[PDB]
Scaffold this motif. Structure first.
Motif, short mmCIF file in Angstrom:
data_model
loop_
_atom_site.label_atom_id
_atom_site.label_comp_id
_atom_site.label_asym_id
_atom_site.label_seq_id
_atom_site.Cartn_x
_atom_site.Cartn_y
_atom_site.Cartn_z
N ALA A 131 0.85 -1.18 0.00
CA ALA A 131 0.00 0.00 0.00
C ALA A 131 0.89 1.24 0.00
O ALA A 131 0.51 2.31 -0.48
CB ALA A 131 -0.92 0.00 1.22
N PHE A 173 0.50 4.04 -2.52
CA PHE A 173 0.14 5.39 -2.09
C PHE A 173 1.26 6.39 -2.36
O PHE A 173 1.04 7.60 -2.31
CB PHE A 173 -0.18 5.37 -0.59
CG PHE A 173 -1.65 5.36 -0.26
CD1 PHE A 173 -2.61 5.07 -1.23
CD2 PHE A 173 -2.07 5.64 1.03
CE1 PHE A 173 -3.96 5.07 -0.90
CE2 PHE A 173 -3.42 5.64 1.35
CZ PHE A 173 -4.36 5.36 0.39
N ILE A 204 2.42 11.45 1.25
CA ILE A 204 1.28 11.69 0.37
C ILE A 204 0.65 13.05 0.63
O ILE A 204 -0.32 13.16 1.37
CB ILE A 204 0.21 10.60 0.55
CG1 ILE A 204 0.84 9.21 0.55
CG2 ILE A 204 -0.83 10.71 -0.55
CD1 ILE A 204 0.18 8.25 1.53
N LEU A 261 -3.00 10.58 -3.43
CA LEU A 261 -4.39 10.47 -2.98
C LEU A 261 -5.35 10.72 -4.13
O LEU A 261 -6.22 9.90 -4.42
CB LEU A 261 -4.67 11.47 -1.85
CG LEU A 261 -4.21 11.08 -0.43
CD1 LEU A 261 -5.38 11.12 0.54
CD2 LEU A 261 -3.54 9.71 -0.38
N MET A 300 -8.78 16.47 3.28
CA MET A 300 -8.62 15.16 3.90
C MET A 300 -7.18 14.96 4.37
O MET A 300 -6.94 14.52 5.49
CB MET A 300 -9.05 14.04 2.94
CG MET A 300 -7.97 13.55 1.99
SD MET A 300 -8.40 11.99 1.19
CE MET A 300 -8.67 10.95 2.62
N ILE A 301 -6.22 15.30 3.51
CA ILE A 301 -4.81 15.17 3.84
C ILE A 301 -4.39 16.28 4.81
O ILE A 301 -3.40 16.14 5.54
CB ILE A 301 -3.93 15.21 2.57
CG1 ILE A 301 -4.18 13.94 1.74
CG2 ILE A 301 -2.45 15.33 2.92
CD1 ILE A 301 -3.84 12.67 2.48
N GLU A 313 -6.42 17.44 7.27
CA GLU A 313 -6.91 16.99 8.56
C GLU A 313 -6.28 15.65 8.91
O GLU A 313 -6.05 15.34 10.08
CB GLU A 313 -8.44 16.87 8.54
CG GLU A 313 -9.14 17.98 9.31
CD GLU A 313 -10.37 18.50 8.59
OE1 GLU A 313 -11.25 17.67 8.26
OE2 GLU A 313 -10.46 19.72 8.35
N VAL A 319 2.22 14.51 4.53
CA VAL A 319 1.91 13.31 5.30
C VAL A 319 3.07 12.33 5.28
O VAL A 319 3.34 11.69 4.27
CB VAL A 319 0.65 12.59 4.76
CG1 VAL A 319 -0.11 11.92 5.91
CG2 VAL A 319 -0.26 13.55 4.00
N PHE A 368 1.45 7.83 9.01
CA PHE A 368 0.62 6.94 8.22
C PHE A 368 0.42 5.62 8.96
O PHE A 368 -0.69 5.08 9.01
CB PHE A 368 1.26 6.67 6.86
CG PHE A 368 0.35 5.96 5.90
CD1 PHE A 368 -0.59 6.66 5.15
CD2 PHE A 368 0.44 4.59 5.73
CE1 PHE A 368 -1.42 6.00 4.27
CE2 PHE A 368 -0.39 3.92 4.85
CZ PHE A 368 -1.32 4.63 4.12
N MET A 409 -0.88 6.03 12.85
CA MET A 409 -2.32 6.27 12.90
C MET A 409 -3.11 5.01 12.53
O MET A 409 -4.15 4.73 13.13
CB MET A 409 -2.70 7.41 11.96
CG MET A 409 -3.68 8.40 12.57
SD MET A 409 -5.31 8.33 11.81
CE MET A 409 -5.13 9.56 10.51
N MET A 410 -2.63 4.27 11.54
CA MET A 410 -3.31 3.05 11.10
C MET A 410 -2.81 1.83 11.88
O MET A 410 -3.60 1.14 12.53
CB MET A 410 -3.09 2.84 9.60
CG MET A 410 -3.72 1.56 9.08
SD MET A 410 -4.13 1.66 7.32
CE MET A 410 -5.81 1.06 7.33
#
Ligand SMILES: [Ca+2]
Ligand SMILES: [Ca+2]
Ligand SMILES: [Ca+2]
Ligand SMILES: [Ca+2]
Lengths: 148, 20
Positions: free
Chosen positions: A88, A92, A100, A105, A124-125, A127, A136, A141, A144-145
């Motif tokens: 990913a 990405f 990113i 995105l 979106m990026i 926030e 980002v 990345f 957060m995930m």
């Protein structure tokens, strides 16, 4: 490994200082573009951005003696950490940097399923950018995930 | 609410489920 000399390099800096044609010590699409338009007279409006983003090894704000120093000396870009989410990660990374900002995105997130307009992708990026430094960084990345 | 969170995160998740 190997400590670059500040004497000779500085000379390169002397140019990198004039190269800025302002006396700021930072080369950005602003000054770089001025020369790239009156001298380079070619680099697209977006190119100098790709040229600047290409040199943003540290991507702190703009071109700096050290970052520009390395990009000019060597051109290596290894990697030894991305074990999982590396797929990913390339999916990405679109452009091929690691962060990113929005480009990736836009295309990847619009082709991935939905259609994130320039508004969504941008905000979106904005926030999503936990750190909110301007881009980002994978560090967030995953934090957060992956990381709780 | 804010748009983004759990939006593009799910996006990647989308792939995995049906990579192809
Ligand atoms: Ca400057
Ligand atoms: Ca930089
Ligand atoms: Ca990228
Ligand atoms: Ca960030």
């Amino acid at each position: 490994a190997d400590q670059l000399t500040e004497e000779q390099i500085a000379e390169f800096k002397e140019a990198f200082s004039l190269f800025d044609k302002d006396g700021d010590g930072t080369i950005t699409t602003k000054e770089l573009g001025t020369v790239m338009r009156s001298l380079g007279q070619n680099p697209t409006e977006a190119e100098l951005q790709d040229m600047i983003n290409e040199v943003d090894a540290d991507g702190n704000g703009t071109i700096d003696f050290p970052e520009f120093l390395t990009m000019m000396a060597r051109k290596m870009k290894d990697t030894d950490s991305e074990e999982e989410i590396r797929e990913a990660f390339r999916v990405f990374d679109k452009d091929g940097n690691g962060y990113i900002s929005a480009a990736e995105l836009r295309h990847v997130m619009t082709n991935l399923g939905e259609k994130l307009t320039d508004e969504e992708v941008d905000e979106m990026i904005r926030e999503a950018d936990i750190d909110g430094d301007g881009q980002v960084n994978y560090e967030e990345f995953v934090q957060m995930m992956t990381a709780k | 609410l804010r748009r983004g969170q759990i939006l593009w995160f799910r996006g990647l998740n989308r792939i995995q489920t049906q990579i192809k």
